[PDB]
Design a protein around this ligand. Structure first.
Ligand SMILES: *[C@@H]1O[C@H](CO)[C@@H](O[C@@H]2O[C@H](CO)[C@@H](O[C@@H]3O[C@H](CO[C@H]4O[C@H](CO[C@H]5O[C@H](CO)[C@@H](O)[C@H](O)[C@@H]5O)[C@@H](O)[C@H](O)[C@@H]4O)[C@@H](O)[C@H](O[C@H]4O[C@H](CO)[C@@H](O)[C@H](O)[C@@H]4O[C@H]4O[C@H](CO)[C@@H](O)[C@H](O)[C@@H]4O[C@H]4O[C@H](CO)[C@@H](O)[C@H](O)[C@@H]4O)[C@@H]3O)[C@H](O)[C@H]2NC(C)=O)[C@H](O)[C@H]1NC(C)=O
Ligand SMILES: *[C@@H]1O[C@H](CO)[C@@H](O[C@@H]2O[C@H](CO)[C@@H](O)[C@H](O)[C@H]2NC(C)=O)[C@H](O)[C@H]1NC(C)=O
Ligand SMILES: *[C@@H]1O[C@H](CO)[C@@H](O)[C@H](O)[C@H]1NC(C)=O
Ligand SMILES: *[C@@H]1O[C@H](CO)[C@@H](O)[C@H](O)[C@H]1NC(C)=O
Ligand SMILES: *[C@@H]1O[C@H](CO)[C@@H](O)[C@H](O)[C@H]1NC(C)=O
Ligand SMILES: *[C@@H]1O[C@H](CO)[C@@H](O)[C@H](O)[C@H]1NC(C)=O
Ligand SMILES: *[C@@H]1O[C@H](CO)[C@@H](O)[C@H](O)[C@H]1NC(C)=O
Ligand SMILES: *[C@@H]1O[C@H](CO)[C@@H](O)[C@H](O)[C@H]1NC(C)=O
Ligand SMILES: *[C@@H]1O[C@H](CO)[C@@H](O)[C@H](O)[C@H]1NC(C)=O
Lengths: 215, 338, 202, 329
């Protein structure tokens, strides 16, 4: 309704550029300044700058001066953020946000895009079933193994099944490749009765999987 | 042409009148240098080189043992079987460039590919009689007074995925290092000077080249894990005296952009590289002992096991001097012309 | 330059929770950021409550000293809280819930025939919905302890029932895997009076 | 006295793989079972026989000891380098018909002067062509007393060849597998200490009122500064610092040696490179029968005359064996 939709997660070699796009819907784009804020993994929030859609005029934090470029396309209500000369400490989640008033109250945020600065190289996940044979509540799941980079999203039954789902954080293997599990506890009675499919999506490799998890 | 293995001969510019030990060894061991040598380029041609199985490397090793057998005679040599006493004369010691040359009917191929990693096919090839002048500098951790890479830093290893196999680094720009024991105080105490800005920049360039071979990981430089002191320090010989230098200030993730001082000791009790054992040498000569040397390469060992912070840790190492010769002999193989 | 205190705090449901931010004024805004999500604005101009936000959150300010209060901590209030003035943002305050000890359910998963055909074997032990966070899983193969063999991962604190879940993963080559028969994981938690063990036959 | 080509005879065996035999059979006739000695002024320094043998020994080595590379200023030469079984065998060099070989039976011939007890023989005795420096190996000993021989003792530039009364044993070994070049020699310090005094004593007879001192080599090619020889096809170079020492140990004496692949040739000016040493234990037990010494020149400090080991001219080695022989027509 009133929304900011950003581009998908990225991986870029050090020294390269990344561009993040932010598309605003449900308000007058020209009316408010758009800001970009980044957040390294596990850390706090860092302001990068703002852009005026009327002017296209920009203000960038000194830390990023000369490395960041904020442009906009008022025709399609889109703001772009481009960071150049990426260094590994630039790995973070990037957010676009609307300044509502000259309180600098950011009432509206995009869901945020992960940018992994890394020399190489994308890998799709292998998706293995975590079958359940033990017993009145049974557990089943999906092992999403050996993928790069973050992130992967996992759902169950195309989103119909949500109660009792635990998608764990990925652990970074000794191979440098990530790995995670998604589990769900279900009624034991269900196991013969109902189909269970986990839906694994890894956009950085455009890998998408539907995996039926069988007894 | 045709790869083959034989006995090469050495040439050098040693002078019959010179009392220095490398000269004295060479005047008997080596013939004089050809003032104008003939190098025959092959245009487009392909040959396979293996720096890790190169009979030329094994020959220089036997040679440097022969030099040290004559130059650096220890007072006491300790072998598990025995303890031995002998004459301990001090000597004049300055490594001199050695050429290794092919006899009649054989040639030495030279790879001209500017950034050859050393095991594989060579794009540009030439035939020569002799290698360039190689100084048999014995050292650990830092490679001294050698040759630099023409284009960009090169990393060379027998097996990069195998942490236990040494990494030979060739630098793009040499970095100067000066170690001095001032005139008499503790006569064993000495020091080394390095430009932190130049060394810090050198580190980043090798770190960046390393990251290409481990794209996943971040790259950390750290002090030696442990072992014999010969390896845990930057160990070398200057004017017959054995220096052992603390490179904690060199292999550091946060290096000072200033002049760097490394502490050194002149050691009389050493572990031999030539053979397994211990030697005791005479106390140092009097006066100022100084070596101004060009750091042109590195010898690193990568840590084994699972990486804690998704970091790969590299620490200075060494000990098998054949690797020192490989750093210079990588681009040559002997072939028998037919 | 922005200060925030405390760094983290544990609190029971219903408690009064107070956070402090230290900075001239104005203006000061408070955000709540839950795990994996974007920040959500709660308090603007120091004291003003954003529309549609529960009345339980509030903010106060005097001069350059500010405070943010949850009058009655609810389970869905697990988040980090950030004060901000213009560009600058406080390091944030992590607020998590304190609750009655809960035992974990335990489940164990054999490696799949899919994964075997590729030559590696991952065995997985699950600890489900427990509290406190502290927990200890150790792997037994044929009565043999293992070390460095496994990795584990913990969820964020659950927003409804305030529990945690934990995954521990045993990886080893198909060769090693078939050199043994009985695979077991042993879970020790304050909720469990005797440590539980789950296992299966190759 | 006349100049002619002698011919050699030996105890060579046609079936033997050892190279001195192999060379001897094609080059050399069999030993005479029935030798004749008929009792009836010489120069060992001006003897054509020595120049002959030198050519033979060169010839022997050319066939037995082919280095992998021969380094000459003009050129490099590369050739087949096979390891071989190497043990010098005694050679008899004999006069052609119409010629005879005079033999000095004189009790103690210095080798330049007149010999009184002379005999005629067809053949010389069996001489092993041991190529060595500093120490003379596997040769003949003096019958009566240690003998000093020189073209001129007053001229320090002339080598001094000493022939011993009683031989001293020397064992040099490279043990079975460490540095494969590393080797050692064992000599009885007591035996050698006495020998030195008995040669130091003889020397004081020619240099009265002077003390006799032994010291290490003054300098030169490595072949000459060390005791160099060939043992089982491998070239030994041994540090004689412990031998030429005014204060020799009564105890056992150990000399450090190296097996060397790069040598300076005595056959000709140049360098030869030989193959790496064979596997296994390499040992030579030899009898030290003579010395090659050089006397220091100049005004004497401390009234001591200093002597140092020398060599290099392999002809001097043969002169130690051919002194008592002249060729007659
Ligand atoms: C990496 O490579 C680098 C370069 O490629 C290496 O750095 C090189 O290191 C070598 C040394 O290893 C250097 O060459 C050496 O320079 C020495 C110093 O040279 C200067 O000083 C001389 C004397 O100084 C007095 O006299 C002058 C009057 O002429 C006066 O102006 C001055 O103020 C002072 O009072 C001066 O005359 C020179 O011209 C230079 O200015 C130099 O002394 C070295 O000579 C050594 O060694 C050579 C052979 O290399 C011999 O010919 C010499 O005789 C001298 O040897 C002496 O020292 C030995 C060891 O102690 C003795 O045992 C010798 O027998 C000999 O001792 C005799 O002489 C003494 C008097 O000096 C007597 O007291 C003794 O009893 C004996 O008679 C040599 O040339 C290079 O300069 C240097 N290059 C660079 C760029 O810096 C680096 O080492 C390498 N690192 C590694 C690890 O390989
Ligand atoms: C001196 O002569 C004897 C032989 O007369 C040599 O002894 C030979 O030694 C080799 C190895 O060195 C052995 O394998 C042979 O069995 C020995 N032969 C005999 C007949 O004993 C000795 O090596 C000679 N020394 C030198 C320096 O040439
Ligand atoms: C060994 O020989 C070298 C030269 O041949 C000489 O300088 C050295 O002094 C000798 N050994 C001893 C103990 O003197
Ligand atoms: C040297 O090589 C490095 C690669 O490690 C490269 O980054 C640097 O620019 C090079 N510089 C020169 C002058 O060759
Ligand atoms: C110096 O080297 C020693 C031993 O090589 C090492 O333990 C030490 O850490 C180094 N210096 C410092 C200041 O640590
Ligand atoms: C080594 O590391 C410490 C910090 O770990 C730093 O303070 C010191 O200056 C460093 N020295 C050099 C020479 O890198
Ligand atoms: C200068 O030194 C600091 C540490 O004191 C270091 O972080 C920085 O990268 C250095 N920069 C240069 C250009 O040397
Ligand atoms: C050998 O000769 C020396 C002197 O040349 C003499 O002193 C010694 O007695 C002699 N020994 C024998 C047994 O003839
Ligand atoms: C040779 O003399 C030196 C001293 O001049 C002495 O140390 C050594 O023991 C002697 N060696 C022998 C074998 O006599």
């Amino acid at each position: 309704q009133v929304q900011l939709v950003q581009s998908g997660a990225e991986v870029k070699k050090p020294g390269a550029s990344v561009k993040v796009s932010c598309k605003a819907s449900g308000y007058t784009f020209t009316g408010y300044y758009m800001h970009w804020v980044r957040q390294a993994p596990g850390q706090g929030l860092e302001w990068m700058g703002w852009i005026n859609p009327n002017s296209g005029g920009t203000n960038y934090a000194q830390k990023f001066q000369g490395r960041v470029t904020m442009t906009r396309d008022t025709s399609i209500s889109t703001a772009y953020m481009e960071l150049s000369r990426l260094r590994s400490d630039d790995t973070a989640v990037y957010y676009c946000a609307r300044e509502r008033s000259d309180f600098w109250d950011f009432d509206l945020w995009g869901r945020g895009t992960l940018v992994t600065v890394s020399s190489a190289s994308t890998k799709g996940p292998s998706v293995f079933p975590l079958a359940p044979s033990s017993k009145g509540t049974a557990a089943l799941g999906c092992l999403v193994k050996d993928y790069f980079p973050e992130p992967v999203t996992v759902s169950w039954n195309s989103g119909a099944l949500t109660s009792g789902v635990h998608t764990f954080p990925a652990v970074l293997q000794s191979s440098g490749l990530y790995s995670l599990s998604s589990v769900v506890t279900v009624p034991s009675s269900s196991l013969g009765t109902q189909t269970y499919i986990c839906n694994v999506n890894h956009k950085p490799s455009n890998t998408k999987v539907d995996k039926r998890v069988e007894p | 042409w045709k790869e083959a293995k034989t006995t090469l001969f050495c040439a050098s510019d040693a002078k019959a009148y010179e009392k220095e030990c490398h000269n004295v060894w060479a005047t008997h061991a080596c013939v004089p240098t050809d003032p104008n040598p003939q190098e025959v380029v092959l245009e487009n041609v392909t040959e396979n080189f293996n720096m890790w199985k190169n009979d030329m490397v094994d020959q220089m090793q036997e040679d440097v043992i022969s030099i040290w057998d004559q130059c650096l005679k220890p007072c006491v040599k300790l072998t598990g079987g025995s303890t031995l006493t002998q004459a301990c004369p001090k000597v004049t010691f300055d490594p001199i460039p050695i050429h290794y040359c092919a006899p009649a009917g054989y040639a030495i191929l030279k790879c001209n590919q500017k950034t050859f990693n050393g095991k594989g096919p060579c794009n540009n090839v030439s035939t020569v009689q002799c290698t360039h002048g190689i100084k048999p500098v014995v050292s650990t951790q830092l490679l001294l007074n050698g040759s630099l890479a023409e284009e960009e830093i090169v990393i060379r290893s027998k097996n990069l995925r195998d942490n236990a196999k040494i990494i030979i680094v060739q630098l793009n720009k040499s970095v100067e290092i000066v170690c001095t024991r001032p005139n008499n105080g503790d006569i064993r105490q000495a020091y080394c000077q390095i430009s932190g800005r130049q060394w810090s920049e050198a580190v980043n360039q090798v770190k960046k080249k390393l990251k290409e071979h481990f794209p996943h990981k971040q790259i950390s430089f750290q002090s030696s894990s442990g072992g014999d002191l010969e390896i845990t320090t930057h160990s070398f010989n200057c004017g017959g005296e054995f220096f052992y230098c603390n490179t904690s200030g060199l292999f550091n993730d946060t290096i000072s952009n200033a002049t760097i001082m490394l502490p050194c000791r002149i050691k009389q009790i050493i572990n031999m590289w030539q053979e397994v054992g211990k030697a005791i040498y005479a106390p140092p000569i009097k006066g100022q002992i100084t070596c101004k040397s060009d750091i042109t390469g590195l010898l690193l060992l990568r840590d084994g096991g699972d990486t804690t912070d998704n970091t790969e840790i590299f620490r200075p190492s060494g000990g098998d001097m054949r690797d020192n010769w490989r750093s210079e002999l990588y681009k040559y193989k002997v072939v028998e012309i037919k | 330059q922005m200060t925030q205190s405390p760094s983290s705090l544990s609190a029971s449901v219903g408690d009064r929770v107070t956070i402090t931010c230290q900075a001239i004024s104005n203006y000061l805004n408070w955000y709540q950021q839950k795990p994996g999500k974007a920040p959500k604005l709660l308090i603007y101009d120091a004291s003003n409550l954003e529309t549609g936000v529960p009345s339980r959150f509030s903010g106060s300010g005097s001069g350059t000293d500010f405070t943010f209060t949850i009058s009655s901590l609810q389970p869905e209030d697990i988040a980090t809280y950030y004060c901000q003035q213009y560009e600058f943002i406080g390091p944030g305050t992590k607020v998590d819930i304190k609750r009655t000890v809960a035992a974990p359910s335990v489940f164990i998963f054999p490696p799949s025939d899919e994964q075997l055909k590729s030559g590696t074997a991952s065995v997985v032990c699950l600890l489900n919905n427990f509290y406190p966070r502290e927990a200890k899983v150790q792997w037994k193969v044929d009565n043999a302890l293992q070390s460095g063999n496994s990795q584990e991962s913990v969820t964020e604190q659950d927003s409804k029932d305030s529990t945690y879940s934990l995954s521990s993963t045993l990886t080893l080559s198909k060769a090693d895997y078939e050199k043994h028969k009985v695979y077991a994981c042993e879970v020790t938690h304050q909720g469990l009076s005797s440590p539980v063990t789950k296992s299966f036959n190759r």
